Structure 1
């Protein structure tokens, strides 16, 4: 699926990538590259199949933060990713697991089009490049490193969101998860039992605290 994206290259790889053990040598971009300068970047990632409960609060989170000047970052994946990005428009950055001439995943072509138009997409791949196992993971570390804080509304064990969790750990990014009933979001509950993550027990409080610390 061709995007028909007229995309350039980004002058300077942002400072945030410096922390990487294997930084990206070059980045391609489409849309507003001035979202890269913002005070607060929040990564919102998670399962491809969120419950109406997870979805509902992801929307609230993405919207509220975006409304108050935060920028949402994700991978455009089905589920939490795309839900969070679409509801943060225009203040949202996507890290693509494929080159900017393609659209992945194809099911989200609609929102990805709006992001390229109103937000920002970045790729570590020049052109005619499609996703393979290792390219998702590599895209992932970019989302985690670019962001100040990581929210994972819902996730299972041994998932990509757990990979990312481990990344948020070693890159000292604060990890936040939505409270979930036992057995409904194992991944996020394990992060909670291990103190590897902080719970969001009040949306208004979690967001206001976060704005105050940057703002």
Structure 2
């Protein structure tokens, strides 16, 4: 277990976005810039722990360009898509931690997570001495989806964390987007397209510009 040695406090108010939850957190612990919560466009970017170079390249562009234009990238700091997006969105990014803020998880991402604590924002539902179990990740995911205006899943397999979060975006009526992927690659996101549960990002520039326009950043 890795201690963060973060100094952390609590949010004054629970963000109104969490009202759509059945059991919204009544306290949220925080480290970093809470002003990131008062922005017009929050974009969740989540997905596989193992992205292809293709998926990575486009995750980077989305995160970097959206952040450049005042969008805030929301994720869970996981290996793969999450931590790629958040590093490339700094400092405009918010991590929802699956552990309490006195701990780092995952340890491999400690460098970027420390960067997020310093320049972005990390929130946790858990006060102290709390390491994630399976149920913790799932609860954390609801926070990521509820807080975000729109959700992007660049790449995912069927039966993956990203897929339960995709059904949450559907549940919480958040617009869901995926990268185009070849057949028999990224079966999760291709099944989302197939069932019409997600829309494809068939041109990255248009998606970004359209997105920034609808939320009036540009």
Q: Same fold (TM over 0.5)?
A: yes
Q: Per-residue CA shift, 1:68-96, capped at 9, x if unaligned?
A: 00000000000000000000000000000
- C-alpha separation between the residues in 2 aligned to 1:110 and 1:193? 38
Q: Per-residue CA shift, 1:141-160, capped at 9, x if unaligned?
A: 00000000000000000111
CA root-mean-square deviation: 0.4
Shift of 1:21: 1.2
TM-score (norm 2): 0.98
- C-alpha separation between the residues in 2 aligned to 1:172 and 1:142? 14
SS at match of 2:51: coil
- C-alpha separation between the residues in 1 aligned to 2:171 and 2:132? 25
SS at match of 1:60: helix
TM-score (norm 1): 1.00
Q: Which residue in 2 is equivalent to 1:52?
A: 53
- C-alpha separation between the residues in 2 aligned to 1:79 and 1:7? 26
Q: Per-residue CA shift, 1:37-91, capped at 9, x if unaligned?
A: 0000000000000000000000000000000000000000000000000000000
SS at match of 2:44: strand
SS at match of 1:73: strand
Moved over 4 A (4+): none
- C-alpha separation between the residues in 2 aligned to 1:14 and 1:34? 11
Q: Per-residue CA shift, 1:125-144, capped at 9, x if unaligned?
A: 00011000100000000000
SS at match of 2:14: coil
- C-alpha separation between the residues in 2 aligned to 1:184 and 1:105? 26
Shift of 1:115: 0.1
- C-alpha separation between the residues in 1 aligned to 2:23 and 2:161? 19
Q: Per-residue CA shift, 1:11-54, capped at 9, x if unaligned?
A: 10001000001111210000000000000000000000000000
